[PDB]
Symmetry: T
Subunit: 150 residues, 12 copies
């Protein structure tokens, strides 16, 4: 609706994603365990940092960030499912990639939204984030033997 | 119950607790803003580390950690509330200290349990976490003008 | 690029006055929050001195000529300074800080619009990066004062 | 020409330029040898890192970077010449400066094109690169005793 | 036995184990070579440290550590075999894991022994070691696509 | 938990005497092993001042009140001190050090048993970690003197 | 008192002061807890280092430092009191400030004294220590809301 | 030293082609080992770019004139390159890498024998050091391929 | 202590004008030595900004009240500034730099004599350490100009 | 004896030597305990690294390293003895020095052999190792109050 | 002699001392080799730095440092002797001490002289140097079992 | 002249040269002062290190290094001259370059001699030293606007 709605929505998103990353991190099995386990820790730090920056930018424009698991669940478009059946490393990475994709497309919407509201600072912050998400999408798709936009 | 269930319960508690720490971090105001904004950053890292160590130890012993916000909410005894009304620094710190005290007393229950079960590794892990928690209770209570045990 | 150059040179002047004011606060502050805000002012001083040098070199890079004397900074700055003559509270000093950060925020916003319209993309993004941080500072110092960022 | 085509052209350019920086670095003679010999190592790193980011951005948008010397030579607008006749430091810095100007001018075209197409990430990336190039032009022109735009 | 005999027994074990880790480090082949080759280095340092710490704790309680290959071979329960036939990465990891479990299980005896004997320092030393072994067991079993205890 | 508190406060007293004893040795030592042992005392000084602080802060965390004056430390310590009067050899000084280490080891052992029975697991493990290092220093300083750790 | 006796007097003072810093460190309460608790750690290091340098300068001029608590108590002009009555942060800082003022003025006596006895080294050392004490007095007075010499 | 000079200049050409090949592999690779190999190609890139600068500067130091254009490297390289057209498995890309490493090992071996005969000792030891590292890479990358170093 | 206070405050003023002069030189300089000198001014800027802050804080510590506006700095400084209007050579710029360093040397010498007479031993040593560094810069920059330090 | 045999023989030696370093490190007593206890740690890492490099060079030339204690004992010319009766610091160092000299001398044989075979890499590796052994011999000989070759 | 002559005399002395430290560093034997050997590198670097600061202060006052070995030999009061007869560690340390005492006492003259002359910078520089020299004398006399001024 | 005598000769040479580096470092004037002044600091450390390594290598082969200025003057082939007249920066670099060339050629003799004697360690040390010297010659000749061997 506006920048404050978008930013807050991403605070909810990033808190679900962050827990998803830990899910993959904890439950992964297979020959790529050691590298993807560590890779997940890197994603966790990186997206935890995005989330703090998003909330603090929300604060800076007069907004009020969601700040409970209850609120995050209610508001996030990012999905979570409990870990039940064993999943393949590729299936865990597909779920990671699908979420990276949703964030890319939503941030793209937020990039357009903020550009037309004239919120230059939030615009540029969202672009910086998308750049990194776009790079991760390429790399994780390459892990999956696929092209970035394939 | 057992060590697995206790440990899983703490995964849930620690996830609710880290988000609270962010809430305190985001909504704090007052002459102590700078010192406490930063101090909350430190608690965030430390309790995020505790969480990953609890989850991993649970994994090491044959368990399967909660790994969704839905599950954390279903299982945490740590309580959260949306920030729908302003709260002073002292009220936020009071909530923090009460949460630390809840974690201390629960960790104490787990320390006794793991000892009774003969799980020495989880026993020493939880003792080290309590050492830190006990230290924080002294310091944050000192901040509030109170003795550690109130 | 006349106005972009003029705007940049205006901010060189502003930043040199702001930076000395940051020292004034650093030097003269008293109160229970001295140790925290004393150090805080060191950080602010470094950062806005760096903003200043970047602003100056962006100007040079577009064929401009930065103001480079105290006399030029005074003739040109919209940032206000006053000698410290009578004691001020920590809150009074932080209000003067915030007022000046709000001033720089709004003027940088005009610079961002200006550079956007002249198509100076480098300068545009630079001023945007500076404003990001200024907006973050305003939130934090206002929280210290017990006020919402825009109230 | 679109964004992929522009980016891939710069992959070619950056690979020729990077070899030119090495040419200057190796053959330079004169009183400012020690500082400029070192400055060229810095330029080498920075522009090789530009190159990598341009190629990886290209990868992220679904393109395929040139990745052979033949391709770089076929596509580059940046020009190279073997080092036969000896040259003054000024002469070498004038080759370096002219090549910097070519890149600035071509990046400006890219900035505009990438804006038109709505590729915000590639847009910002190219603005950041131009910010550095523009700074380099001011500094190397000063070395030549010239204004940056003269 | 007593604490001295147990500690000395482990000095023997850890020296056989350390050489085994080198064996795996040297002879390993397969797609996970680079990360696993490096991992073995990490394990080599860690278990070299345990060994020095075990020997020094033994020294500090009035004991005399085994200090020759002859004594290690005479005393170790950890087994070794010359590398004659090629082994797969999985088989190598299985030898690693099986030795880690042997150590975990003997350390458990040492923990229990040392608790009866009242040697609190050696007790906690051995608990800290098992903590790490337990974590390694989880991770290498995960690499093997198995639960830690299966 | 009077006893855990009392034991901890006693060691606060002890460690402050011991820390000054380490400086005594640090300052007055002479002989061929000066450069090594002079620096070794600096390490011991840091480590035992760190123990002391952590003992005091744990006492604070259990609701105690740590001794915080030289007078209190002298009134309560079982660690002994003597002014440096007649010259002492390197070995003589190391024997005083080793002797104090042994006293603290044996007293920490008593506190380890005390905190066990009292159910204070945090203080229990703190004390164990401290004894681990003490026993290591005893082995090493006894080695310097040409003796076995427990002889 | 000559240079030796002055220095030896300060060894005693510095040891009482150092224990006083710990007292404040331990017992402090109030909203400035976190920053001032940490500040006491800094002063503790700094004045411990002053003390080691004073004693080693004494050693270097043929002197014999006091090296027991008994001697320190017998010789110190710096005073201590057991912590009984709870004290505000300001009261603790007044005590800190008061003792810094004592040391400043005694060091000034040491500076004059040591100039007269032609001990240039001890002279410059004490000046350096006074420079920092003077800075502390200014900063700690500002905390108390006072001018430095007020 | 014409033949030394000539050998060194030939390796400048080779190393520049190899380095772009490393980037080609780096950029296009796909498969379960992407994350490890992608970083490993960065290490290789740095290392062989470093070898290259060292080869060129040694050439400079002996009175030589390094090739310093893309055209000169192609005219003078024995390492071959081809545009990336059809998808290749990670093993195929590592086979191309190992093949090129082997070519350099073998050519450096010739350089080692040549500089020895000419008595250029510095170049000799520089080449040997480089070969040590290439021989090590061949072992590790053949092991990745499930193969023995020389099979 | 009025003269020490006034002298210190006079130097706060000087160092603020000098500091902006160092940026003027840093920004406007051209010529073959550009890269070294441009970076060297960044060094002088940091060092002299540090000197200034230490002077103000020492002035604070002796009960003084530092000048803290561009206006006060201009009203009190003996160091002179002039806007950059016509181009100047690197030597011309370094001569302006050296001239200012020499003024500060000579004034600091007066402050060393003054603080010595007034018995301000701390300010005395501070001024001497600053002069030590100023004297070495005069040698080095004179050396840059092909001059002996004192000619 | 060819290069592969020589290298494998050194794998055996270095593994016996490394344990002997630990023997000295653990059992030493006397006034120089602290520096020599430390120097043994440095030697252990250094000769542990020689060992790893020797084994890896053997790998790189198509060889197969000894990789068990049994193989090391079966193949080593370096001798070892349980610590049955206490040794002086001097005597422990003479045993250390004797082993350095043995290695030096054998490496000299390997350096000649490897020169005849035209293995330039292994040649240079062995020379670098001997450079260090030579230095240690001078240094440990000096500690013994003797010239390096007497 | 004036300040310039005094400063220049110390450049000569310090260059001789510099080489004397190497002589001791190279030729020393005995149980304290490893400590003292490293101790001489520290001393070498420290007094090398003193010498450099002495020369540069001379330059800064309009002087001209001796800058050839011939000039150092012609002007030094520090004495050197070729190493012909072997010396104990103590004898070497006594030569080191003797030279330190010589520098102490001549610096003391330079301090008095530079005070009269009104050269404050040089006065403080020499005082800082003498402080370190005084400390070395205490420490090296302690090594020799003696009081500092014995 | 054998290996011992050649190495000892370079001990002498290196001490003369290191003092020459200082002379140039102190007395240099001209527009390149700041970069060349620091470059001499680099050279001083580097050739300072060569000298120690030469002297310790000599020790290791049973020799006794020259260790007084008198012995260095009696033995050096490197020449020194008192700085009576100011020299140009180019003249100072010509003197520098000239001495590097002398060392290069004498190292070449030592390389040949040490090869013929079968001292592989010294051979390799000398080669490594010459590598750097050769690089310096290219670089300093480039500064002077000359080709390395011109
Ligand atoms: Fe934050
Ligand atoms: Fe983890
Ligand atoms: Fe890359
Ligand atoms: Fe050890
Ligand atoms: Fe503490
Ligand atoms: Fe000390
Ligand atoms: Fe290079
Ligand atoms: Fe300040
Ligand atoms: Fe290895
Ligand atoms: Fe210097
Ligand atoms: Fe050495």
């Amino acid at each position: 609706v506006d920048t404050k709605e978008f930013l807050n929505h991403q605070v909810a998103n990033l808190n679900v994603f962050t827990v998803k990353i830990h899910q993959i991190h904890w439950y992964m099995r297979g020959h790529n365990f050691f590298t993807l386990h560590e890779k997940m820790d890197d994603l966790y730090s990186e997206f935890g940092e995005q989330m703090d920056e998003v909330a603090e930018r929300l604060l800076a424009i007069g907004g009020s960030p969601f700040s409970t698991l209850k609120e995050f669940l209610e508001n996030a478009s990012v999905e979570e499912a409990p870990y039940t059946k064993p999943k393949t490393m590729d299936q865990l990475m597909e779920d990671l990639v699908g979420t990276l994709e949703l964030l890319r497309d939503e941030y793209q919407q937020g990039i357009e939204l903020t550009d037309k509201e004239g919120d230059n600072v939030t615009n540029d912050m969202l672009i910086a984030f998308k750049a990194s998400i776009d790079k991760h999408i390429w790399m994780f798709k390459a892990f999956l033997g696929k092209a970035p936009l394939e």
